[PDB]
A paper describes a structure:
The maps revealed two complexes: Lcore-P and Lfull-P-C, with clear ERDRP-0519 density on the L protein. Contrary to predictions, ERDRP-0519 was observed binding within the RdRp domain rather than at the predicted PRNTase site. First, it inhibits the catalytic center by interacting with residue D773 in the GDN motif. The piperidine group displaces D773, creating space for hydrophobic interaction that directly impairs active site function. ERDRP-0519 failed to inhibit the W671F mutant, confirming W671’s essential role in binding and antiviral activity. The central ring forms strong hydrophobic interactions with residue Y667, so any changes at this position are likely to cause steric clashes, disrupting binding.
Conversely, polymerase inhibitors like ERDRP-0519 show greater promise due to the high conservation of the L-P complex across MeV strains. Here we report cryo-EM structures of the compound bound to MeV polymerase complexes at 2.73 Å and 2.48 Å resolution, revealing a unique binding pocket in the RdRp palm subdomain that overlaps the catalytic GDN motif. Structural analysis revealed that ERDRP-0519 binds to the palm subdomain of the RdRp, targeting the catalytic GDN motif and a nearby hydrophobic channel.
Author numbering:
A (entry chain E): 338 to 397
B (entry chain A): 7 to 185, 190 to 584, 652 to 1203, 1231 to 1281, 1296 to 1320, 1329 to 1407
C (entry chain C): 338 to 372, 429 to 507
D (entry chain B): 338 to 375, 392 to 413
E (entry chain D): 338 to 380
Write the structure that this text describes.
């Protein structure tokens, strides 16, 4: 009877892997909303400036 | 004054406030009423304090003269500008227009002396091509009596009146620039006229009506009446437009009858002329449910315009609908688009700044609601298009991007396996694209190009001196002085330290949001029919530079991914078949509907691709914190003191805090953002979409697959059904992002759409043939009155009229008549003070000299810029050979004497160097045949580009550049065999050609010429040379048509090619010194070809004579013509220099040494790499009227003995012959037609030299060092082949 | 075997604890950003097109003066015989009702199609 | 050693109870911002903090 | 004692399933959201 718990523990792991993808979906929605609308960052530095910078620019 | 002249044509808007300001400083009563009374209050406040200057004086005296004349007429009333058009479109006075009447009577006499011989020349040309029995009887009487038909029009006396008033006003302005005497009224039989520098007063003696006009109104009236005269003459004389004439004249009455009563709203009805015609075209749709879709909206708009203006009767509306039904309903498809030519025939409305300010303010201050899912689906399709483009140009590999953790397995496996994405996969998995982040894979190459800055655009003033544009006379206070510069190239070329990456860091660093001197202003557009008026914007230097840099970065990069799925031209010409329908709409107010939230995600993706932080969000963030205003000199703000822009009200001319876009300025970004929503509506409707933008119109082609066994109407109705379903889905999706598709304004059709060359109607072209005829106007838009440029403009407009379906012979006759009249106006009716009697009196007393100057072709020293071979084909090869052939055709038909041919061959040669020969290879070294404006622009542009301290022009321009160009030209051309065209190509692809291209893209206009004249860039010798150039070229023509030298070797009935060789040898004898000239001469099109029309059992006479070299054309019987059927640039330049040098001057080790030395200045390559990389040694009839026959004909060339130029121009001439044969026929009737076009080139042969290994006599100096500037030099060219 | 099961449960506890920190960070962001039939939009919706109203998708006769002019222009621009066109204009002058105008429009479309 | 897991499972239960409070706060915020559409019950958000909501929504 | 712990583990499985549904309905309300844009910039 105690060896039957291994199927239940693996079923917990599938629920957690379903959970964090749904949280990652909520992260994708909150990232898209907060950057397309100005002023919602509450000063983390500007998210539109979160690009990488090497287009052969380097003036500074 | 000096070299500069007052403008000939209208190029500025019409403002009410200018007229009101002139009439208030003149103290004359008037009937104008302003919507904003601020200007009159400012005038009254200035006059109360006793303000005066040199401009307020000399209008007080003019007003005193007007009042003293108006004491004589007791019952006088002033008529405003829109209400007087019917009075001013039909105005005549015998005594005021005596001189121009005598000049045009003399021109009628000169044309009548040679009209019959012109007809005989055209008849012999027609009979040579095989149409000797197809010439109509009316053509002879219309060619001979052309001036009688021109003088019989209703617009002739108004044309004389307005030409006289315009010429005297330009003379007064040109004289007063030098400076005086008080103006005096001139009394005629019908009118009394005063002409001043700024005001023209006309008093009708019978009606006692008084009209006050400015200079721009006189220019507009002259342009309108001259255009109406030309197009009425063209419609009266050509038979094809005769019933069209019976409609257009009626329109010319009807709208004029609306002008005394309606006033300025009448142009709104004129603004309905472009919709309504298309609506009547929609009455010929095969889908009967779409017949009155647009006509209902047009009639509702017309009823609303009549209702708001107080004319609300059922009878007036019903009579207007009956009149429009008479004007627009016709049976010929090809004449439906001719009303398009008559849009500008009624003038232009008067404008105010406050109305356009309210129109912008209504849309730019509107709240919107946007749903998130539609925006994210469009973003997903946008990302899918970018991914598919990068896979297409990098071999199926995905771009560098990181999908989020919540991405679907399909997108993850597509990234892992390098597989593409369809639109369905992007829509169904849009949440997988929510948190993506691209990488940097697009370079920023801004040092390689200079074309973006040298385009001339005006700059706004600084913010702190934003009142600097308004004059002191119209303000209640004293405005601050303006210290900023006014032009883009003036700031750019004087910039001692310029770097495009610093311009990028102006936005990236964020200093653009906090700089104190940023400003933006609006200005009214010049020639439009919209009563409110349309605006264009000007801003300061740095933000404009950032805007152009951003547009070029979108253009050269990501925009090429989106150009592939769409089509730039002609919609790619639109078992199962594909059936399509079309949706056309206008995009006038779509820029005002854009917001930050809609464009933000697309701008973030472009920021991640281009690696630029917060770059593409710049427009909305700058405009939401800045105050806008409309700037006109006569429309002042209602301020009693100087205040900054953040304190002004949100009223009058100001727009305080806009949320929206400017017209232009983000065009490619908005297009690339637009296409995903079209694809989303396509996926939701299940159709295929092609898209095309043209002018102000968007055209969407909806395509569906259909069984091919179905009848045509069922296929078309199914296409219309899925098209209207797509329209409903697209309207809902565009409202989801807030753009207001406006289904009332949108045309849905199954046959036609509007593009650049006309209207496409199921493979047919409906063109505006009479639009270019209205531009056949005396003089051209040049800073100096030049006769040769005017004659070239006349020839160009007549040729463009021929390409859209007008008759060739009548256009040639109109060209001859207009050249004769232009020469007589240039000699006898002009403001040029350099016209002395020594050339005026010998030309005006000798009639035959004027006729021979008008009929002689321009490549051989005459004034006629229209060749006869140009009447059939676009491309004539050698202008000299064609001119000699044309002259021999004139001698054969007794139009010109034989001795004139001798006078061509014994002509005095000009003085030009090897560089001038290499720049113009087909020139015959004539005397004073250049243009004043082109030479002045070249000298001014060269002076400024030498004296520019800009670091991008580091070493291209220097004082010894011209000596280097002359040395290179003498190295290329001074050989034992002279090849001008190869030297032209090598000089064009070299550093000299790059310098000439950079000087050519710099448009100086009037302002840079005035700046260089004040700074001393132009010396006095050049000014005195170019001020007398027209006089000297008239003297050169007079000397050419007078000299008595004759040679017995010259003879008619000889080859035109050999005569061209003799002329080129004689006129270039100083530089050539007897050495041969090779590669310039070709056979003439009309001389070498003879045509014949053959039935079934008829035999060709030319084939019986023994000629077997011909092309064969076939037209079947019973076809309805009207009805529907059923590396770097510098590296490429270096390779071009190497291959042209090796092909022309031989292939040897010394030849490749010289070729490598020439090509090393463009790219850093070795001799071996250059030797490896260089190579070693279905006619296009669309877009013209030629299509109308060419969809049924069949062309075979089996009997043509194969030289290539003859092979294409023969097929083009055959299509022109078949177009001319079936011009006035609805149907090819009951018999097949065979056209034989025989080529006779037993003459016209040249001794061929092939590649005779031409060596170099001179020494190639090159330069002491190579210019390593990235504009012209490629340091790392790599290898591609 | 049960000791091997114990280590997997320990790995679950760390992953649950990592998730609750992640939800707490999004709880801080979403509370500041975002802040039940309370209010309505004041006609910010697009007007849906009906079968009665005319649009770009098709012409339906309605209201007053413009529709009669459009129908008469359809009669004038057609390829019918001129006596039949005059008789149809006489019937159009006879017709006054809006449903009668729609019936006449359908009948005219059937004549033009055949 | 197998009976030492009692405190570990109770440690998991406090984490899910802490998660359930954070979900209930998130459900409270999204239920507050819903408006009716003329009963779709869709949430609406603004730029700064509901600044356009006075301009767009009907006055109650 | 180990059989008593199995009832607590199944209580965890039901509790995770309840939180996954409430997260899923949280995503549904957030995905169907709308943005209101003001007419004028403030300054
Ligand atoms: C979101 N959406 N949906 C649709 C559709 F209905 F088609 F589906 C269309 C759009 C949309 O906004 N289109 C759009 C795309 C671009 C521009 S434009 O303003 O830049 N440009 C084109 C139109 C006319 C003005 C012209 C400026 C040209 N200047 C500069 C060059 O010299 C001459 C004047 C305007 C509108």
């Amino acid at each position: 009877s105690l060896l039957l718990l291994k199927g239940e523990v693996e079923s917990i792991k599938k629920q957690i892997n379903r959970q964090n993808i749904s949280i990652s979906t909520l992260e994708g929605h909150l990232s898209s909303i907060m950057i397309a609308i100005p002023g919602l960052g509450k000063d983390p530095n500007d998210p539109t400036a979160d690009v990488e910078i090497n287009p052969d620019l380097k003036p500074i | 004054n000096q070299i500069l002249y007052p403008e000939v044509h209208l190029d500025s808007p019409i403002v009410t406030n200018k007229i009101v300001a002139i009439l208030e400083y003149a103290r004359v009563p008037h009937a104008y009423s302003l919507e904003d009374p601020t200007l009159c209050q400012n005038i009254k406040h200035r006059l109360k304090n006793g303000f005066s200057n040199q401009m307020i004086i000399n209008n007080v005296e003019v007003g005193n003269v007007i009042k003293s004349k108006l004491r004589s007429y007791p019952a006088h009333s002033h008529i405003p500008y829109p209400n007087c058009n019917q009075d001013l479109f039909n105005i005549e006075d015998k005594e005021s227009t005596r001189k121009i009447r005598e000049l045009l009577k003399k021109g009628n006499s000169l044309y009548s002396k040679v009209s019959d011989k012109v007809f005989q020349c055209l008849r012999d040309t027609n009979s040579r091509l095989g149409l000797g029995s197809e010439l109509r009887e009316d053509i002879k009487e219309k060619v001979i009596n052309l001036g009688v038909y021109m003088h019989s029009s209703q617009w002739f006396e108004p044309f004389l009146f307005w030409f006289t008033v315009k010429t005297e006003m330009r003379s007064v302005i040109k004289s007063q620039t030098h400076t005086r005497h008080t103006p005096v009224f001139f009394t005629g039989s019908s009118v009394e006229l005063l002409i001043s520098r700024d005001l023209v007063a006309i008093i009708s003696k019978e009606s006692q009506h008084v009209y006050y006009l400015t200079f721009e109104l006189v220019l507009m009236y002259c342009d309108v009446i001259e255009g109406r005269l030309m197009t009425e003459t063209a419609m009266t004389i050509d038979a094809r437009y005769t019933e069209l004439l019976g409609r257009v004249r009626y329109m010319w009455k009807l709208i004029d009858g609306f002008f005394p009563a309606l006033g300025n709203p009448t142009y709104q009805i004129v603004a309905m002329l472009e919709p309504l015609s298309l609506a009547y075209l929609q009455l010929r749709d095969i889908t009967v449910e779409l017949r009155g879709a647009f006509l209902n909206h047009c009639f509702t708009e017309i009823h609303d315009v009549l209702d708001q203006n107080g004319f609300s009767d059922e009878g007036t509306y019903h009579e207007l609908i009956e009149a429009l039904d008479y004007i627009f309903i016709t049976d010929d498809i090809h004449l439906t688009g001719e009303i398009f030519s008559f849009f500008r025939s009624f003038g232009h409305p008067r404008l105010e700044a406050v109305t356009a300010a309210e129109n912008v303010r209504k849309y730019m201050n509107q709240p919107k609601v946007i749903v998130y899912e539609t925006l994210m689906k469009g973003h997903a399709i946008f990302c899918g298009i970018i991914i598919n483009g990068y896979r297409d140009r990098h071999g199926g590999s995905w771009p560098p991007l990181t999908l989020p953790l919540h991405a679907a397995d399909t997108i993850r496996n597509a990234q892992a396996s390098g597989d593409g994405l369809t639109h369905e996969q992007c829509v169904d998995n849009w949440k997988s694209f929510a948190g993506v982040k691209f990488g940097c894979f697009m370079p920023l190459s801004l040092d390689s190009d200079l074309t973006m800055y040298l385009k001339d655009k005006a700059l706004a003033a600084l913010q702190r001196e934003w009142d600097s544009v308004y004059p002191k006379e119209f303000l209640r206070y004293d405005p601050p002085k303006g210290t900023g510069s006014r032009r883009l190239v003036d700031v750019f070329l004087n910039d001692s330290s310029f770097d495009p990456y610093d311009v990028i860091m102006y936005v990236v660093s964020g200093a653009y949001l906090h700089d104190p001197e940023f400003n933006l202003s609006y200005s009214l557009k010049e020639k439009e029919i919209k009563e409110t008026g349309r605006l264009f914007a000007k801003m300061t230097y740095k933000m404009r530079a950032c805007q152009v840099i951003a547009e070029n970065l979108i253009s050269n990069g990501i925009g090429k991914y989106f150009k592939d799925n769409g089509m730039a031209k002609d919609e790619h010409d639109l078992a199962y078949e594909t059936v399509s329908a079309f949706i056309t709409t206008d995009l006038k107010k779509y820029c005002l509907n854009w917001r930050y939230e809609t464009i933000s995600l697309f701008a973030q993706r472009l920021n991640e691709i281009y690696g630029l932080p917060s770059f593409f969000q710049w427009l909305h963030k700058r405009l939401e914190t800045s105050v806008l205003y409309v700037s006109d000199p006569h429309c002042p703000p209602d301020l009693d003191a100087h205040i900054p822009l953040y304190k002004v009200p949100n009223d009058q001319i100001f727009i305080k805090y806009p949320m929206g876009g400017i017209e232009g300025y983000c065009q490619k970004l908005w297009t690339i953002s637009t296409i995903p929503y079209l694809y989303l509506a396509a996926y939701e409707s299940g159709v295929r979409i092609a898209s095309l933008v043209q002018g102000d119109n968007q055209t969407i082609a909806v395509t569906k697959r259909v069984p091919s066994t179905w009848p045509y109407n069922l296929k078309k109705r199914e296409a219309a059904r899925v098209t209207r379903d797509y329209f409903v889905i697209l309207r809902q999706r565009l409202h989801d992002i807030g753009h207001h598709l406006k289904a009332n304004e949108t045309i849905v059709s199954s046959h036609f759409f509007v593009y650049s060359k006309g209207i496409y109607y199921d493979g047919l072209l409906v063109s505006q043939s009479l639009k270019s005829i209205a531009r056949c106007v005396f003089w051209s838009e040049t800073i100096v009155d030049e006769t040769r440029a005017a004659c070239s403009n006349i020839a160009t407009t007549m040729a463009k009229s021929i390409e859209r379906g007008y008759d060739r012979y009548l256009a040639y006759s109109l060209n001859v008549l207009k050249v004769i009249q232009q020469i007589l106006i240039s000699l006898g009716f002009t403001i040029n003070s350099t016209m002395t009697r020594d050339v005026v009196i010998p030309l005006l007393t000798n009639n035959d000299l004027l006729i021979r100057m008008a009929l002689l072709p321009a490549p051989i020293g005459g004034m006629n810029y229209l060749n006869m071979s140009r009447l059939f084909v676009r491309n004539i090869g050698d202008p000299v050979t064609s001119s000699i052939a044309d002259l021999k055709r004139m001698i054969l038909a007794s139009l010109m004497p034989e001795e004139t041919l001798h006078q061509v061959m014994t002509q005095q040669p000009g003085d030009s160097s090897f560089l001038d020969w290499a720049s113009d290879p087909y020139s015959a070294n004539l005397v004073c045949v250049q243009s004043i404006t082109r030479l002045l622009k070249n000298i001014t542009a060269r002076f400024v580009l030498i004296h520019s301290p800009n670091p991008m022009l580091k070493g291209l321009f220097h004082d010894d550049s011209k000596e280097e160009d002359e040395g290179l030209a003498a190295f290329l051309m001074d050989r034992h065999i002279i090849v001008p065209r190869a030297a032209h190509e090598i000089l064009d692809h070299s550093v000299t050609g790059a310098r000439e291209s950079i000087a050519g893209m710099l448009d100086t206009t009037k302002g840079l010429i005035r700046a260089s004249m004040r700074k001393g860039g132009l010396t006095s010798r050049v000014i005195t040379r170019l001020s007398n150039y027209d006089y000297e070229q008239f003297r050169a023509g007079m000397v050419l048509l007078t000299g008595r030298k004759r040679n017995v070797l010259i003879d008619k009935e000889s080859c035109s090619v050999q005569l061209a060789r003799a002329l080129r040898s004689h006129m270039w004898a100083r530089l050539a010194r007897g050495r041969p000239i090779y590669g310039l001469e070709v056979p003439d099109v009309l001389e070498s070809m003879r045509g014949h029309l053959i039935r079934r059992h008829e035999t060709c006479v030319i084939c019986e004579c023994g000629s077997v070299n011909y092309g064969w054309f076939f037209v079947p019987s019973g076809c309805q013509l009207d009805d529907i059927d059923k590396p770097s640039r510098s590296l490429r330049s270096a390779v071009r220099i190497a291959t042209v040098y090796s092909w022309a001057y031989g292939d040897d080790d010394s030849s490749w040494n010289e070729a490598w030395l020439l090509a090393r200045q463009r790219a850093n390559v070795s001799l071996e790499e250059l030797r490896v990389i260089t190579p070693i040694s279905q006619v296009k009839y669309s877009g013209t009227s030629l299509v109308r026959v060419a969809r049924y004909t069949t062309i075979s060339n089996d009997n043509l003995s194969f030289t290539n130029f003859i092979y294409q121009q023969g097929m083009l001439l055959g299509l022109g012959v078949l177009e001319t044969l079936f011009r006035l026929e609805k149907d090819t009737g009951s018999s097949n037609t065979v056209l034989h076009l025989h080529v006779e080139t037993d003459c016209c042969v040249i001794p061929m030299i092939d590649h005779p290994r031409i060596p170099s006599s001179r020494k190639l100096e090159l330069r002491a060092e190579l210019c390593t500037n990235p504009l012209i030099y490629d340091n790392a060219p790599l290898i591609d082949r």
